[PDB]
């Protein structure tokens, strides 16, 4: 019992932070994509013109 207390706490501590990171890096991908889109919008802005 006592040992599994210690496995569990550690298991609970770091997967959550790790997901927290993963979301934080989804901001990175997703918004990098949304930057690439802004680059295109600007190119278009002169292309139709």
């Amino acid at each position: 019992g006592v040992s599994k207390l210690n496995e569990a706490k550690a298991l609970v501590d770091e997967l959550n932070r790790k997901a927290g990171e993963q979301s934080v890096l989804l901001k990175t991908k997703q918004d990098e994509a949304d930057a690439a889109l802004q680059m295109i919008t600007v190119s278009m802005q002169d292309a139709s013109e």
């Binding site: 569990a8 609970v12 997967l15 993963q22 989804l26 994509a33 889109l37 295109i40």
Partner: protein, 49 residues
């Protein structure tokens, strides 16, 4: 170019966004046991001493 960049880029953010939901489900599954274990741990204390 940015067309072919953003495209591949979008396949990243959401496939990562797959893991964070599985991870979140796992965390949700884990929490259930945490709230029962809140009182139990201090019960587990007294036994062994």
């Amino acid at each position: 170019e940015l067309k072919e960049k953003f495209q591949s880029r979008t396949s990243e953010a959401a496939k990562l966004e797959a893991e964070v939901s599985k991870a979140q489900e796992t965390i949700k599954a884990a929490e259930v046991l945490i709230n029962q274990l809140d009182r139990e741990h201090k019960r587990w204390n007294a036994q062994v001493v």
